[PDB]
Enzyme design. Sequence first.
Site, PDB file in Angstrom:
ATOM      1  N   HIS A 109      -0.550   3.071  30.925  1.00  0.00           N
ATOM      2  CA  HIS A 109       0.648   3.752  30.468  1.00  0.00           C
ATOM      3  C   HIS A 109       0.750   5.133  31.104  1.00  0.00           C
ATOM      4  O   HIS A 109      -0.256   5.794  31.370  1.00  0.00           O
ATOM      5  CB  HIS A 109       0.647   3.879  28.947  1.00  0.00           C
ATOM      6  CG  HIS A 109       0.803   2.575  28.233  1.00  0.00           C
ATOM      7  ND1 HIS A 109       1.919   1.780  28.371  1.00  0.00           N
ATOM      8  CD2 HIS A 109      -0.017   1.927  27.374  1.00  0.00           C
ATOM      9  CE1 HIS A 109       1.779   0.698  27.630  1.00  0.00           C
ATOM     10  NE2 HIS A 109       0.613   0.763  27.014  1.00  0.00           N
TER      11      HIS A 109
HETATM   12  C1  LIG Z   1       1.404  -3.078  27.660  1.00  0.00           C
HETATM   13  C2  LIG Z   1       1.002  -2.874  26.142  1.00  0.00           C
HETATM   14  O1  LIG Z   1       0.457  -3.757  25.556  1.00  0.00           O
HETATM   15  N1  LIG Z   1       1.302  -1.595  25.470  1.00  0.00           N
HETATM   16  C3  LIG Z   1       0.938  -1.339  24.014  1.00  0.00           C
HETATM   17  C4  LIG Z   1      -0.530  -1.165  23.895  1.00  0.00           C
HETATM   18  O2  LIG Z   1      -1.042  -2.085  22.893  1.00  0.00           O
HETATM   19  C5  LIG Z   1      -2.456  -2.363  23.084  1.00  0.00           C
HETATM   20  C6  LIG Z   1      -3.385  -1.309  23.338  1.00  0.00           C
HETATM   21  C7  LIG Z   1      -4.745  -1.588  23.515  1.00  0.00           C
HETATM   22  C8  LIG Z   1      -5.203  -2.937  23.431  1.00  0.00           C
HETATM   23  C9  LIG Z   1      -4.295  -3.987  23.175  1.00  0.00           C
HETATM   24  C10 LIG Z   1      -2.927  -3.699  22.999  1.00  0.00           C
HETATM   25  O3  LIG Z   1      -4.728  -5.368  23.091  1.00  0.00           O
HETATM   26  C11 LIG Z   1      -6.087  -5.623  23.161  1.00  0.00           C
HETATM   27  O4  LIG Z   1      -6.268  -6.960  23.632  1.00  0.00           O
HETATM   28  C12 LIG Z   1      -6.876  -4.697  24.073  1.00  0.00           C
HETATM   29  C13 LIG Z   1      -6.724  -3.261  23.628  1.00  0.00           C
HETATM   30  C14 LIG Z   1      -7.316  -2.313  24.686  1.00  0.00           C
HETATM   31  O5  LIG Z   1      -0.909   0.200  23.565  1.00  0.00           O
HETATM   32  C15 LIG Z   1      -0.208   0.837  22.326  1.00  0.00           C
HETATM   33  C16 LIG Z   1      -0.840   0.424  21.122  1.00  0.00           C
HETATM   34  O6  LIG Z   1      -0.766   1.490  20.197  1.00  0.00           O
HETATM   35  C17 LIG Z   1       1.267   0.396  22.331  1.00  0.00           C
HETATM   36  O7  LIG Z   1       2.113   1.560  22.000  1.00  0.00           O
HETATM   37  C18 LIG Z   1       1.684  -0.121  23.623  1.00  0.00           C
HETATM   38  O8  LIG Z   1       3.147  -0.442  23.571  1.00  0.00           O
END
Ligand SMILES: CC(=O)N[C@H]1[C@H](Oc2ccc3c(c2)O[C@@H](O)C[C@H]3C)O[C@H](CO)[C@@H](O)[C@@H]1O
Lengths: 533, 533
Positions: free
Chosen positions: B174
Site C-alpha cells: 500500500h
Molecule cells: C490489498 C488488501 O488486501 N488491502 C487490505 C489489507 O488487508 C489485509 C492486511 C494484512 C493481511 C491480510 C489482509 O490477509 C492476510 O492473509 C495476510 C495479512 C498480512 O490491509 C488493511 C487491513 O486493515 C486494509 O485496509 C486493506 O484494504
Amino acid sequence: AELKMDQALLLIHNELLWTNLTVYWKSECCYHCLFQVLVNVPQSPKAGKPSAAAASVSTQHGSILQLNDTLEEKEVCRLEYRFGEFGNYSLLVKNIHNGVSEIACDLAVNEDPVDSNLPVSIAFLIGLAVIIVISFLRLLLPPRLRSVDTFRGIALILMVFVNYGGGKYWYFKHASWNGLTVADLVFPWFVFIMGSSIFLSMTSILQRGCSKFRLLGKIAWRSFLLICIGIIIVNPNYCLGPLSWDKVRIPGVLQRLGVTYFVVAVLELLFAKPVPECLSLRDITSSWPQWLLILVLEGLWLGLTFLLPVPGCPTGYLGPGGIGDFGKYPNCTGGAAGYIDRLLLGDDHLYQHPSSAVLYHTEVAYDPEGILGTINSIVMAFLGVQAGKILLYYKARTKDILIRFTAWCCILGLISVALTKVSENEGFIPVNKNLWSLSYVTTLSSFAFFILLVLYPVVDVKGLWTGTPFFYPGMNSILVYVGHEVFENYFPFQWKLKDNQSHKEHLTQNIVATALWVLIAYILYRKKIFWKI
Amino acid sequence: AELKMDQALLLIHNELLWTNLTVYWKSECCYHCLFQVLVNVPQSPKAGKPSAAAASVSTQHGSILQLNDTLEEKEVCRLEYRFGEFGNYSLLVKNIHNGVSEIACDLAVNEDPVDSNLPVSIAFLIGLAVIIVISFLRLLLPPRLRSVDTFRGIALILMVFVNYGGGKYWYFKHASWNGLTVADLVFPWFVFIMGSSIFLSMTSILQRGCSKFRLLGKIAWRSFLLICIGIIIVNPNYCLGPLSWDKVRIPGVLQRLGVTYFVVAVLELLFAKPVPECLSLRDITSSWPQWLLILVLEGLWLGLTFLLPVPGCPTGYLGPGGIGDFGKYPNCTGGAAGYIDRLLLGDDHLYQHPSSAVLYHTEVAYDPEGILGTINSIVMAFLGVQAGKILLYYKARTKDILIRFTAWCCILGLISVALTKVSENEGFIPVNKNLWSLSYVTTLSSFAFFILLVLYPVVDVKGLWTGTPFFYPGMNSILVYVGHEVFENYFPFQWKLKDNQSHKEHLTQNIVATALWVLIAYILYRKKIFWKI
Ligand SMILES: CC(=O)N[C@H]1[C@H](Oc2ccc3c(c2)O[C@@H](O)C[C@H]3C)O[C@H](CO)[C@@H](O)[C@@H]1O
Ligand SMILES: *[C@@H]1O[C@H](CO)[C@@H](O[C@@H]2O[C@H](CO)[C@@H](O)[C@H](O)[C@H]2NC(C)=O)[C@H](O)[C@H]1NC(C)=O
Ligand SMILES: *[C@@H]1O[C@H](CO)[C@@H](O[C@@H]2O[C@H](CO)[C@@H](O)[C@H](O)[C@H]2NC(C)=O)[C@H](O)[C@H]1NC(C)=O
Ligand SMILES: *[C@@H]1O[C@H](CO)[C@@H](O[C@@H]2O[C@H](CO)[C@@H](O)[C@H](O)[C@H]2NC(C)=O)[C@H](O)[C@H]1NC(C)=O
Ligand SMILES: *[C@@H]1O[C@H](CO)[C@@H](O[C@@H]2O[C@H](CO)[C@@H](O)[C@H](O)[C@H]2NC(C)=O)[C@H](O)[C@H]1NC(C)=O
Ligand SMILES: CC(C)CCC[C@@H](C)[C@H]1CC[C@H]2[C@@H]3CC=C4C[C@@H](O)CC[C@]4(C)[C@H]3CC[C@]12C
Ligand SMILES: CC(C)CCC[C@@H](C)[C@H]1CC[C@H]2[C@@H]3CC=C4C[C@@H](O)CC[C@]4(C)[C@H]3CC[C@]12C
Ligand SMILES: CC(C)CCC[C@@H](C)[C@H]1CC[C@H]2[C@@H]3CC=C4C[C@@H](O)CC[C@]4(C)[C@H]3CC[C@]12C
Ligand SMILES: CC(C)CCC[C@@H](C)[C@H]1CC[C@H]2[C@@H]3CC=C4C[C@@H](O)CC[C@]4(C)[C@H]3CC[C@]12C
Ligand SMILES: CC(=O)N[C@H]1[C@H](Oc2ccc3c(c2)O[C@@H](O)C[C@H]3C)O[C@H](CO)[C@@H](O)[C@@H]1O
Ligand SMILES: *[C@@H]1O[C@H](CO)[C@@H](O)[C@H](O)[C@H]1NC(C)=O
Ligand SMILES: *[C@@H]1O[C@H](CO)[C@@H](O)[C@H](O)[C@H]1NC(C)=O
Ligand SMILES: CCCCCCCCCCCCCC
Ligand SMILES: CCCCCCCCCCCCCC
Ligand SMILES: CCCCCCCCCCCCCC
Ligand SMILES: CCCCCCCCCCCCCC
Ligand SMILES: CCCCCCCCCCCCCC
Ligand SMILES: CCCCCCCCCCCCCC
Ligand SMILES: CCCCCCCCCCCCCC
Ligand SMILES: CCCCCCCCCCCCCC
Ligand SMILES: CCCCCCCCCCCCCC
Ligand SMILES: CCCCCCCCCCCCCC
Ligand SMILES: CCCCCCCCCCCCCC
Ligand SMILES: CCCCCCCCCCCCCC
Ligand SMILES: CCCCCCCCCCCC
Ligand SMILES: CCCCCCCC
Ligand SMILES: CCCCCCCC
Ligand SMILES: CCCCCCCC
Ligand SMILES: CCCCCCCC
Ligand SMILES: CCCCCCCC
C-alpha cells in the site's frame, strides 16, 4: 498473589539453634521418585527468634516432606500431608524439652484452603437439573446405526472439553505415565469405532457389487489424506513461526489413524466373506486369517517391548525415566518404544512435551503416537471390527448381539485384571496411554463393549433414546476434530480471563466452547452438510 | 551481513579538521517531510586520518542527504542520489584547496548494487512464455455473467498475492499516504463488483415474484453475517493471545462491505423498477432518487472533510501527520476522518499499524476502513450498480453497452484528472486509499469501467476467452478470502526461508501460494462446492 493454581503457601519456622534444615518434597502420585529440594531454612540466630522460609507446594495430590539436617545429612522429621488450594500453612520445627533432646515438627493451618472441585460439582448438578427439566417438560407436552453415531459423539464431546483445557483439572488431563484419567479414554474409543465402521461400510459396499481393486483405491486415498492432514495442518503450531523441516513432528493422532485404517481395512478386504443369514461362532471362525495375523503382531509388540536391548538402558524397561525409578535411568523414557522412535525418526521429529515431563521431570522427547505403539492401535481397531461383525452377523436376533457384547466385555476385562493386577504401577503390564500398552487396549475395549451393550438396545432396538445431542457431532467427526484444532484460539471458543488462576473461570470457558461445537454440528446436520474423508 | 532488505551501506569519511558533521536523510518520496538524523561523523583528529562513520540508507526510493556543521548549524553540502540494494558507497567530505577554502563532498561506489527488480522481470517473462506455450499447444491440438466472475477472480488473485507479502516490493504494498500502487486497486474493484452483483441478483429475484420483505430480511442477514465474520474471525491476530474487548478492532474490510451492501441494497430495493425491453437515458432517469441521495451523501462527505473543525488541528487537513508537512501537525493523521474515528470508537478500537507509520513516522492510530469513508464506499458500490444497470437494460445491443461503458469511463477519468491535477500530492483531492477520497473512487471506477469494456465483448459476447483461470476464484470469492485469512501461516502457503532478506525467495513463496489458492478454487469448482453469504 504469589500462589498459582493448585498451590498452597508453606511457612517453615526453624527454632533449632545449631541445625540447618533442607526441606525435600515428593508427591505421593510420583512412583518410586526422588525427593526434590523445596526450600533451605537457615538456623535460628537466637532463642525465641525462629528463622522463616516460604515455599509453594503443589496441592493436586498428597505431599511428602522430608526435613534433613544439611550439615549431617540426617533426617530430622518426616511429614505426610495433603495440602489444599490457596491454603496458608505453617510448619514449626522445634526441639521438645520434655525430658529429651528430640526434635518434633508440627503443621498448623493459618488460613483454610478453598474447595477446588466445587465448580465441577456445581456443573454436574446444573447439567443433571437441565436433563430432568427437559425430560419432564416433554412429558407434559443399509441404515446408519444410531448407537455408533451416539458413541462417537460422546467421544467427540469429551475430546473438545479436555483438549481445550478441561478446566485445568488434573483428572481431565492425561496421566503422567501410568493410570487412567478422563482424557485417556477418547482416543482408543475413536480407534474402536473406526474399526466398526470399517466392517459396516465394507460389507455394504462389497454386497452391492463394487470390486475389491476399486475399494482398495478408496482405502489408500483415505489413508493418504488422514496422514497428510495430521502432519501439515494439525501437528504444527503455526503461531510460533513458519514451518521448517528440522522441527516437523511426523507422528500424530491422524497419522496413527491413517496407518491403522490402512492395515485393518486391507486385512478385512483381503479375506472378505459374505455375511450368512445362539451357540454359533461363525463371526470368529470365519475370520481366522485375521486373528492369526493379529496375534502374530501382538507377539511382535511384546517381543520388542520386553526383549529388545536398548543401549545404555535396561531391557524391558516400562518406566518414565527422569526422576522416576529413583532417578537411575533419566534418559530412558519409553524404553524400547522411545528408542525405536529416536533411532528411526530422531528427537527433532518427535513430540517435545510428553505428559511425564511435569511429574517425573523427563528431558528427552517422547511421542505417544510412536511407531511401536501402532501395533496395539491395530489390535484395538480389530476389536472394533469384531463389534461390527456381531452387529451384522446376528442382526435379526437382539439377544444374540447382547450375549456377545457381554462375553467380550467380560473376557477382555478379565485379561486387564491379570495384566494390571488391579494396580496403577504394579502388574506385568500397567495401563499406559504413552506406550499404548496391551492392558490399555484390553481395558478400553472392555469399556467400549460395555457402552455398546447399553447403547444398542436403548437407542437402536427399543428407541427410548435418540442419542440427542450426541449423534449430531458423531456424523461430522472429521469436521469437529479438524475444526477445533484450527479455531482453538478463536472467539467465542476462547477469550481473555479475568483470573487465569481460577478453576471456575477455566471450566466455564471450556464448557461453553464445547457446547458451541455441539451447536455447530447441529446446524450442519440440519443443513445436511456431512464431510467424509 | 548488517544490511537488511532494500538497504545500502554508506561510509562517510570526514577529512575536515575543525568541523563536526551531522548527516541528515530525507526520502524523495516523503512529501514536505523533515530531515532525520542518519549518523554523526566526528572531526578528523589529524591530517590524512579521516574519521569514518557507517550508516544504512534505504534504497526503495531516491535519497536526499544534507550534511550540516554541528557546531554552527550551517550546511556544508547537499547530495541527491538513488542508492541501490546491497550496495557499498563511500562519501568523502574534504575541503578543496584549489585557491578557495570551500568544502566539496563526492560519492564513490565501492561495490556495485544488485538488481532488485530482476526476480519480477524474470517472473513476468516466465508467465508470458507459459501463456504463449499453452496458447500454441491448444492451437495445435438468468445465467451468470462470465466477465464479472473473471474480473472478481483477477481481483482475488491480486489480493492473495499482495496480502501474502507481494515479494516484499514497495510497489506491491500500500502507498504510505498518497498515490496508487498495485495493492491499492483490489478493494474498490470488489466494492464495484459487489454493487453490480447487487443489481443483477435483485433484478433476477424480483422478476420471479419474490416479495420485498423477504428480500429485505435476506439483505439484513447477509450484512449481519459479513460484519460478524469481519469483526470476530478476520480482524483479530489470535497468535498474540485470547480476544480482549479493550483491544478489539471494530472497523475492517468485511464490516465496510456489510455496511455498504446493506445501504446500497436497501436503496435499490426501495426504488426498484422493472427493466423495460441508442440515445436513451432510461437507466439513469429511472433511478433519480438514488442519484439524489448519492449526491447528498457525497456533499456530506465533502463538508465533513473540508469544513469540520478538529481540535488542535487545521480545518480541511488531508495530510498524514507525523514528520509530514514539515512536522507541524504530528497527531493529525487523517484530519476529520481520523478525528471522527477516535471520537466515536476510540484509539484502542482502530487500526494500530497504518501505512503512513513507516514513511511519515506517525504515532497515532488510524483506520483505513473508518466511518467517514463509508460514504465513498457507498458511492463506488452505486457506480457498480450503474454498471449492472447498463448491462441489464441494454442486454440485446452490445454496441449500446460498449458506448455506455466508454462514456462512463471517460467521464470518471475526466473527473479524476480535474480533482488530482495529474499529480500525486498536489490537487484539490489527491488520491488516497486511507481517506477513501473522491478522486480515489473516481479513478478506480474509471479503471473498472474500462476493464468491463475490455472483458464483456471478449468473454461474454464473442467467447474468444473463457476467463480461465480467473472465474474459478471468482465464483468462490468469500471462501478464498476467509481461507487465505485463516490459513495464512500454514504450509504450503508459508515456510521457513533460507534468506529472509531476499526478494527472490519472498516472490517465489508468494507466487506459489497464490497459485495454490487458484488451484484450490478450481478444485472447488470441479466439485460444485459454492458458498454464498
Ligand atoms: C490489498 C488488501 O488486501 N488491502 C487490505 C489489507 O488487508 C489485509 C492486511 C494484512 C493481511 C491480510 C489482509 O490477509 C492476510 O492473509 C495476510 C495479512 C498480512 O490491509 C488493511 C487491513 O486493515 C486494509 O485496509 C486493506 O484494504
Ligand atoms: C535425608 O537423610 C536420610 C538419612 O536418614 C537419607 O536416607 C539415606 O539415603 C542414603 C542415600 O543418600 C542411603 O544410602 C541410606 O540408606 C538412607 N538411609 C535411610 C535410613 O533411609 C535421605 O536420602 C536424605 N534425603 C535426601 C533427599 O537425600
Ligand atoms: C499466612 O498466615 C500467617 C499467620 O501465621 C500470616 O502472618 C501474619 O501476617 C499478619 C499481616 O501482616 C501479621 O500481622 C501477623 O503478625 C503475621 N503472623 C505471623 C505469625 O507471622 C501471613 O501473612 C499469611 N500469609 C498470607 C499470604 O496471607
Ligand atoms: C542545516 O543548516 C541549514 C542552514 O543553511 C538549515 O536551514 C535553516 O533551517 C532553519 C530552521 O532550523 C530555517 O529557519 C532557515 O531559514 C534555514 N535556512 C536555509 C538557508 O534554508 C537546516 O535546517 C539545517 N538542517 C537541519 C536538519 O536542521
Ligand atoms: C565497502 O568498501 C570498502 C572499500 O572502499 C571496504 O573497505 C576495505 O575493506 C578491505 C577488507 O578488509 C580492506 O582491505 C581495505 O583496506 C578497505 N578499504 C578502505 C578504503 O577502507 C569495505 O570493507 C566494504 N564494506 C563491506 C561491508 O564489504
Ligand atoms: C514374527 C513376529 C511378527 C512376531 C514375533 C516377534 C518375536 C519372535 C521377536 C520380536 C522382538 C524379538 C527380540 C528382539 C531382540 C532380541 C535381543 C537379541 O540379543 C536376542 C533376540 C531378541 C530377544 C529377539 C527375539 C525375537 C523377538 C522376541
Ligand atoms: C418417551 C419415552 C419412550 C421415555 C424416554 C426415556 C429416555 C429419554 C431415557 C429413559 C432411560 C434412559 C437411559 C438410561 C441409562 C443410560 C445409560 C447411560 O450410560 C447413557 C444414557 C442412557 C442410555 C439413558 C438415555 C435416555 C433414556 C433412554
Ligand atoms: C445534508 C447533508 C446530508 C449533506 C450536506 C452536509 C453539509 C451541509 C454539512 C456537512 C458538514 C458540515 C459542517 C461541519 C462543521 C462545521 C463547523 C461549524 O463551526 C460551522 C458549520 C460547519 C462548517 C458545517 C457546515 C455544514 C456542513 C458542511
Ligand atoms: C480459439 C480462438 C477463438 C482464439 C482465442 C484467443 C483468445 C484466447 C485470446 C485472443 C485475444 C485475447 C485477449 C486480448 C487482451 C486482453 C485484455 C487483458 O486486459 C486481459 C486478457 C484479454 C481479454 C485477452 C484474453 C485472451 C484472448 C481473448
Ligand atoms: C484427549 C486427546 O485429545 N488426547 C491427544 C492430545 O491431542 C491434543 C493435544 C493438545 C491439543 C489438542 C489435541 O487440540 C487442540 O484443540 C488444543 C491443544 C491443547 O494430546 C496428544 C497429542 O500429542 C495425543 O497423544 C493425545 O492422544
Ligand atoms: C548454616 O548455614 C549457614 C550458611 O552458610 C552457615 O553459615 C552456618 O554455619 C550453617 N550452620 C551449621 C550448623 O552448619
Ligand atoms: C566535535 O564533537 C566532539 C565530541 O563532543 C567535541 O569534543 C569537539 O569539540 C567537537 N568539535 C567541534 C569543532 O565542535
Ligand atoms: C488406574 C487403575 C486402572 C485399573 C484397571 C481397571 C480394571 C477393571 C477392568 C475392567 C472391568 C470391566 C469394566 C466393564
Ligand atoms: C474396476 C476399478 C479398478 C480401479 C483400480 C484402482 C487401483 C488402486 C491402486 C491403489 C494402490 C495403493 C498402494 C498403496
Ligand atoms: C485411486 C486413488 C489412489 C491414491 C493412492 C494414494 C497413495 C498413498 C498410500 C498411503 C498408504 C499409507 C498407509 C501405509
Ligand atoms: C536394532 C534395530 C531395531 C529395529 C526395530 C524395528 C522396529 C520396527 C517395527 C515397528 C512395527 C510397527 C507396525 C506398524
Ligand atoms: C471461530 C468460528 C469457527 C467456525 C467454524 C465452522 C466450521 C464449519 C464450516 C462451515 C463453513 C460455512 C458453510 C455455510
Ligand atoms: C412488497 C410490497 C412493498 C413493500 C416495500 C418494503 C420496502 C422495504 C425496504 C425499505 C426498508 C428500510 C429499512 C431501513
Ligand atoms: C413474505 C415473507 C415475509 C418475511 C418478512 C421478513 C421481515 C424481515 C425484517 C428484517 C428487518 C431488519 C432490520 C435491520
Ligand atoms: C430474517 C433474518 C433477519 C436478520 C436480521 C439481522 C439484523 C442485523 C442488521 C445488520 C445491519 C447492518 C448495516 C447497518
Ligand atoms: C463534533 C461532532 C462530530 C460528529 C460527526 C458525526 C459523523 C457521523 C457521519 C458519518 C457518516 C457515515 C455514513 C455510513
Ligand atoms: C498517482 C498518480 C495519479 C494519477 C491518476 C490517474 C490519471 C488518469 C485518470 C484515468 C484516465 C482513464 C483511464 C482508463
Ligand atoms: C458486436 C460488437 C462486437 C464487439 C466490438 C469489439 C470492440 C470493443 C472492444 C474495445 C477494446 C478497447 C481496447 C483499448
Ligand atoms: C492449509 C490447508 C488449506 C485448506 C483450505 C480449505 C479451503 C476449502 C475447504 C474445504 C474443506 C473440505 C471439503 C471437502
Ligand atoms: C506430507 C509431508 C509434508 C512435509 C512438510 C515439510 C516442510 C518443509 C518446509 C521447508 C523449510 C525447510
Ligand atoms: C460456580 C461454578 C460454575 C461453573 C460453570 C457452570 C456451567 C456453565
Ligand atoms: C464437569 C462438566 C459437567 C458438564 C455439565 C453440563 C454443562 C453445564
Ligand atoms: C530468479 C527469479 C525467480 C522468481 C520466481 C519464479 C516464479 C516461481
Ligand atoms: C510478478 C508476478 C508475475 C507472476 C507471473 C506468473 C507466475 C510465474
Ligand atoms: C457541497 C460542498 C461542500 C464544501 C466543498 C468546498 C469546500 C472548500
